Paper text:
The Ras proteins are master regulators of cell proliferation and survival that transduce growth stimuli emanating from cell-surface receptors to cytoplasmic kinases responsible for orchestrating a comprehensive cell division program. Ras proteins are cytosolic, membrane-bound GTPases that bind guanine nucleotides and are regulated by their nucleotide state: guanosine triphosphate (GTP)–bound Ras adopts a conformation that binds Ras effector proteins with high affinity, leading to their activation and downstream signaling, whereas guanosine diphosphate (GDP)–bound Ras adopts a conformation that cannot bind effectors and thus is inactive. Here, we report our initial findings on an alternative approach, one that exploits directed evolution to discover miniproteins having extraordinarily high affinity for the most functionally relevant surface of Ras, the effector domain. High-resolution crystal structures demonstrate that the miniproteins bind Ras as a dimer and interact via a distinct binding mode that captures the Ras effector domain in an open conformational state, which can be stabilized by insertion of a proline at Asp-38 in Ras.
In light of the homodimeric nature of the miniproteins, we reasoned that the miniprotein residues must have been constrained by symmetry during the directed evolution such that the most favored amino acid at each position was the best compromise between the two sites within the dimer. As KRas is an asymmetric target that forms markedly different interactions with the two miniprotein protomers, we hypothesized that breaking the symmetry and permitting each protomer to evolve independently might afford improvements in binding. To test this, we used a dual-display YSD system in which two miniproteins based on 225-11 A30R (primary protomer a and secondary protomer b) were codisplayed on the yeast surface, inspired by prior work by Boder and co-worker. After randomizing selected residues in both miniproteins, screening for binding at low-nanomolar concentrations of KRas-GppNHp, and merging consensus mutations, we identified a heterodimeric miniprotein, 225-15a/b, with 13 mutations overall across both protomers relative to the 225-11 A30R parent. The 225-15a/a homodimer bound KRas-GppNHp with ∼3-fold reduced affinity compared with 225-11 A30R, and the 225-15b/b homodimer had no detectable binding. However, the 225-15a/b heterodimer bound KRas-GppNHp ∼10-fold more strongly than 225-11 A30R with an affinity of 60 ± 20 pm, which to our knowledge is more than an order of magnitude stronger than all known Ras effector proteins or synthetic ligands. 225-15a/b binds with subnanomolar affinity to all three Ras isoforms (KRas, NRas, and HRas) and to both wildtype KRas as well as the oncogenic mutants G12V, G13D, and Q61H. 225-15a/b also preserves selectivity for Ras over other GTPases with relatively weak (>100 nm) affinity for Rap1a, RalA, and Rab25.
Numbering used by the authors:
A (entry chain C): -1 to 32
B (entry chain A): 1 to 30, 38 to 166
C (entry chain B): 0 to 33
Write the structure that this text describes.
């Protein structure tokens, strides 16, 4: 099923605050898979 | 394949963006911020943060800077003020990183200009006092561009 | 003028596409932080 969970991009309409969250989560995901 | 997060800082117009573009896209005129390279036989993945010359404080910008593992501190060899400003950037980096020992490389850019106001010895001296390497670059001719970034990766690996 | 927001990478993006997107997002967020 799953290992580290891949975050979903919060969308084309996302706020900067949502993207800042996504940026951290995606950093963590990509580091967790390495 | 190890990932490195590199950050480029320095005064307005020193050539931070031109250096990044030359590294990634291999050209110069007068978006990708990632490159796969092979340093000393080792495959490395570089992400580059190309910062702004005009400082503006924000908590979020500091957070983006803290992600950096190594910093290029860039001045232009025909802009003494940008050379004097290097101290500002170095101290800001130690502060964001809350460390006295952050991987850094001093970069003197625009070395294609015969008319310079900062001499090689002046810059080598400063770098010596910091205990960091000095590399001369020209984003224009591509002189030293790979060398500056690869040397930063070697600096990170001294940690 | 103004920073280009990178487009969402897509739910089935490759790890390399996510990495490329992440580096772009890092720079975008840095630029727009106000
Ligand atoms: N001759 C020469 N011009 C250069 C070199 N690097 C950059 N330039 C020129 O210097 C100017 C500023 O370059 P730029 O890449 O925008 O610098 P910056 O440090 O990113 N500026 P900013 O702080 O505003 O983001 C441009 O005209 C650019 O072409 C170089 O090595 N040689
Ligand atoms: Mg720039």
């Amino acid at each position: 099923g799953g290992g580290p969970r891949r975050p979903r991009x919060p969308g084309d309409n996302a706020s900067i605050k949502q993207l800042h969250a996504y940026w951290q989560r995606l950093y963590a995901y990509l580091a967790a898979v390495a | 394949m190890t990932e490195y997060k590199l950050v480029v800082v320095g005064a307005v117009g020193v050539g931070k963006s031109a250096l990044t573009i030359q590294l990634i896209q291999n050209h110069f005129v007068d978006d990708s911020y990632r490159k796969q390279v092979v340093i000393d036989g080792e495959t490395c993945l570089l992400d580059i943060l190309d910062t702004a010359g005009q400082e503006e404080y924000s908590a979020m910008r500091d957070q983006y800077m803290r992600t950096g593992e190594g910093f290029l501190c860039v001045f232009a060899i025909n802009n003494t003020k940008s050379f004097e400003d290097i101290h500002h950037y170095r101290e800001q980096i130690k502060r964001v990183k809350d460390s006295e020992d952050v991987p850094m490389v001093l970069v003197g850019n625009k070395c294609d200009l015969p008319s310079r106001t900062v001499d090689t010895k002046q810059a080598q001296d400063l770098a010596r006092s910091y205990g960091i390497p000095f590399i001369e670059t020209s984003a224009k001719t591509r002189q030293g561009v790979d060398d500056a970034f690869y040397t930063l990766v070697r600096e990170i690996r001294k940690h | 003028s103004g920073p280009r927001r990178p487009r969402x990478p897509g739910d089935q993006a490759s790890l390399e596409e996510l990495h490329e997107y992440w580096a772009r997002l890092w720079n975008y967020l840095y630029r727009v932080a106000h």
